[PDB]
Design a protein around this ligand. Structure first.
Ligand SMILES: NC(=O)CC[C@H](N)C(=O)O
Lengths: 387, 239, 120, 239
């Protein structure tokens, strides 16, 4: 069945050069660094030194060599993916990029003085789909912290490891209606939702309660690396030394929660708060974060590896929570205008998710007075207005 | 060869398999080649001490740097805590000297900007290669490294620190410097900038003063292998 | 409470002024405690910092000379308080601490003290 | 400069004038130059140890030589009485290492031929220059040198000596070896034979194997200046 599609790629000749084979593969949107086609990529590598012809591939060699990636290449080259005509999609994305570049905004970061060193004009957008198509523009290679954008991920980890009933025994599932720095609880003396700081602290208190931080961080980093498909998931220690000597609202919230006795039994508040700072100090790039919000756009399956990471119940729960209260006080307006599950942060990242279709990431250091990036919000509005 | 005995303390370091093995090569001009497991990141425990000594010298002058540390081999293990006849650490290579030279860098500035400055300088030295930070090995060695805390408290008791310096924050900063992780290919750019006349072998930029490079080369040649330094100079004879 | 029972309800205070000092300035004791923690010569499940702070608090207790005269007199007896006559210490504990004070109760001067004075 | 503190022990050595000062220079090719009072003889105490180490290595092989002596710096004074983890002297430069390497030179023959043998090698190295023997400084330091006797008895107690070796005779032979006196001009011929590849710069003959010369040069570079060796390598960097 690969012969007919190879002849369709061909123009009549039995022999097709490797330069023609890599041509129009970018049109399909599938990059060369996919571990699913790592067998085919290693095949191309080994045939490049040893072909005795020079930049040739040939029909029969392609037929005999591909032994496990027949299904993926057949789906890719017959335009069976969820998003066809990818050139038009990239043109739409570039037009929206040019439209969003006109806005200015301001107010990058006051607290966390390490975060204030970023350039206000930095702007990049990365795109990844469920099947594996991806495309990025601008400053997508610059690392940046994942402040407040890791909270749905850690909530999904906690739910998948502990059960939703045990997770929500301590944390409610309702929006607060106030800022994430506000220090108050619900009627039952519990955090309102995992998205705000108190809920994030309580759900960090639940992950592997009997194990010290050294193995807990390795565990959550292993899960994040499996979700990201072994992409770049670093750790910005500069922004972890800051926000620890200067983040005082989080300490007050943690002491308030300790006073209210909402923590699990036998838990030290200071260590959990430090672990929460460490979890929020994880840094990624736009391309690496584009792999995220696509695993949970799918049914917990990573688009790049094809493996299984999260249970469907955890994915559904975190998608519902991001849809409900993923934008602080702007959640109602975001659901009114865009109506897509997205999560923001004080860093500037936006974890825009389209379920079962494609995942996104928008990076903009300037922020609104409410706590969201102005350029990202305008980009999302233009995207939902156009397509 | 087989060897053994990977790591007992710092249990995060003990998770590595014993058969990992990789070698990276980089010359002054830029000729580089690597084999083995060179792409696997690993921590820079005790290998950053000559680098941070070079930073301290290039920032503060060798006389001001050696006002607080000696330039002689200790003759014992690096974990052993004792000072010379003048109640000073013997060399920057051992733990006490490393703590003292971490105390010198940017004394009036907080920890975050200090780490930012040293990371920017080391990235300039590395030619913008991969320089990460293994937080998993920083949570370990902080809740489990007790000998370094004893050494720091002994140094504070002996009043060998610069005035107006917090011991706990400086020790945490030293742990952070020890927790930096690089790959073998990224560390091939290391020991090549200082193999040159302080210039980066790849970018050709001005990184370190020649005096600092000469001093750290002499110190690595003298006591860069703990008690094995004499045998290493006898057989290999290389810094 | 037990030391007050031993003292016959005499004056046993707590000099907090000398407890704030020797905590921010006593560095050799911190080094000793961290060395002991590194050598793993502690009971299981024991926090070193809290135990060291407790040791500082025990060293920070203040008494008068008249109140300390009742001290070293319950243990001069057979473990009974010289004033109240209550049962305070077991005779084994009194004998052991008397032997230890006689042996090494005066640091490097213990040998000379036993040579000349010969008293615990 | 003035300095001071000429010599406390060895009262024969204390009779020298404090303002006595001279320097001699000899090159590999053969040209030489000296200034001042270079003709005055003086004892070669603690300076003959690299020469006797070179003789022992050239006669016995470096593996057999270092079977008993380590190759690491001590970090303490040469009069200090301690060994390494393996109950061996740290290096031949300190007194214990010097005693052990004197125990190895022609162990089956008495002192009368041993001294003639080492004097023949010293005369061949010196190019038949003035290699005397100050008996006044040999009678002293034998009736007054007590630390060396304690070190030798400690080495005998640790059983680090070769089999069938007398402690007192070997210690007396070590004193005799240390009591050899040369002038500055005559000693300038030395340290130039080993500056070359073991060839005498004056006679053009062959004295020492290149392996022995390399070994003694590396050892003198590493720990040839007691506790000041690190500072000497830091500032001068010469053996
Ligand atoms: N958006 C956020 O608040 C990020 C969480 C971070 N720990 C903070 O308190 O700033």
């Amino acid at each position: 069945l690969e012969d007919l599609l190879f002849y369709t790629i061909a123009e009549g000749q039995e022999k097709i050069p490797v330069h023609k084979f890599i041509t129009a593969l970018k049109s399909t949107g599938l990059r060369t660094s996919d571990p699913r086609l790592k067998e085919c990529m290693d095949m191309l590598r080994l045939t490049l030194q040893t072909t005795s012809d020079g930049v040739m591939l040939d029909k029969d060699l392609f037929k005999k060599c591909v032994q496990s990636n027949i299904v993926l290449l057949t789906q890719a080259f017959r335009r069976k993916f969820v998003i066809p005509d990818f050139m038009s999609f990239t043109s739409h994305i570039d037009e929206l990029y040019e439209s969003a570049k006109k806005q200015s905004g301001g107010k990058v970061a006051d607290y966390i003085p390490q975060l204030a060193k970023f350039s206000p004009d930095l702007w990049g957008v990365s795109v990844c789909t469920v099947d594996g198509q991806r495309h990025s523009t601008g400053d997508t290679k610059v690392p940046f912290c994942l402040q407040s954008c890791v909270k749905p991920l850690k909530y999904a980890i906690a739910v998948n490891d502990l059960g939703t009933e045990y997770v929500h025994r301590y944390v409610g599932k309702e929006p607060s209606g106030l800022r994430f720095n506000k220090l108050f609880l619900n009627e039952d003396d519990k955090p309102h939702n995992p998205m705000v700081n108190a809920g994030a602290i309580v759900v960090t208190s639940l992950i592997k309660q009997g194990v010290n931080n050294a193995e807990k961080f390795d565990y959550v980093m292993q899960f994040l690396n499996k979700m990201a498909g072994n992409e770049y998931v670093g750790f910005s220690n500069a922004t972890f030394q800051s926000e620890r000597e200067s983040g005082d609202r989080n300490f007050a919230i943690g002491y308030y929660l300790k006073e209210k006795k909402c923590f699990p039994e036998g838990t030290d508040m200071v260590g959990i708060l430090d672990f929460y700072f460490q979890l929020c100090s994880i840094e990624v790039t736009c391309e690496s974060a584009s792999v995220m919000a696509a695993t949970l756009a799918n049914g917990g399956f990573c688009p790049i590896t094809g493996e299984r990471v999260l249970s469907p119940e955890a994915v559904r729960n975190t998608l519902s929570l991001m849809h409900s209260c993923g934008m602080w006080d702007f959640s109602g307006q975001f659901a009114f205008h865009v109506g897509l599950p997205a999560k923001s942060g004080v860093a500037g990242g936006i974890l825009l998710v389209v379920p079962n279709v494609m995942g996104m990431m928008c990076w903009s250091p300037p922020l609104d007075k409410m706590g969201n990036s102005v350029k990202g919000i305008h980009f999302c509005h233009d995207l939902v207005s156009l397509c």
